[PDB]
């Protein structure tokens, strides 16, 4: 297991424009195109991201390319974030993947407002962190995915991913 494999399980792979769990136009491996309700706007964002006129359809290679960029972006965002960086740095490699997972899904502003969970994570109070993390819109809207990510923070193992 690793962050790529973990997010591939959580996000799936779809080669045509689809709506994510929040109803937002998405493609590939959880690559959010736009929060706009306009499919044409989404198609424009897609073409811009890929560098050609796609008409809402991409290849697996193209999907994996955006995915690599997105994982890269999520990590680089964490390291540029003054609230996230020290917590991330304090973590082991398995829990670091759980942190990337969260940022990938909800964006770094979203995650940085988990102030109390973040503190508990840095103090390595794993059971307490886990309980706090579940007290969230995140958990209620995507409980199965959240439970997997939380188990990863709680245990520092990949048990929730097999």
Structure description:
The chain is mainly alpha-helical. The protein has a single domain, classed as Orthogonal Bundle (Lysozyme). It has nine helices and three strands, in the order H-E-E-E-H-H-H-H-H-H-H-H. It has helices at 3-11, 39-50, 60-80, 84-90, 93-112, 115-122, 126-133, 137-141, 143-155; strands at residues 14-19, 25-28, 31-32. A three-stranded antiparallel beta sheet has the order 1-2-3. Helix 3 crosses helix 5. It is elongated. The N and C termini lie close together (9 Å). It is classed as hydrolase. Keywords: hydrolase, protein-ligand complex, model system. It forms a monomeric assembly. 1-methylpyrrole in complex with T4 Lysozyme L99A. The protein: Lysozyme. The organism is Enterobacteria phage T4.
Protein topology:
Elements: H1 3-11, E1 14-19, E2 25-28, E3 31-32, H2 39-50, H3 60-80, H4 84-90, H5 93-112, H6 115-122, H7 126-133, H8 137-141, H9 143-155
InterPro entries: Endolysin_T4_type (IPR034690), Glyco_hydro_24 (IPR002196), Lysozyme-like_dom_sf (IPR023346), Lysozyme_dom_sf (IPR023347), Phage_lysozyme-like (IPR052619), T4-type_lysozyme (IPR001165)
Keywords: Antimicrobial, Bacteriolytic enzyme, Cytolysis, Glycosidase, Host cell lysis by virus, Host cytoplasm, Hydrolase, Viral release from host cell
Catalytic activity: Hydrolysis of (1->4)-beta-linkages between N-acetylmuramic acid and N-acetyl-D-glucosamine residues in a peptidoglycan and between N-acetyl-D-glucosamine residues in chitodextrins
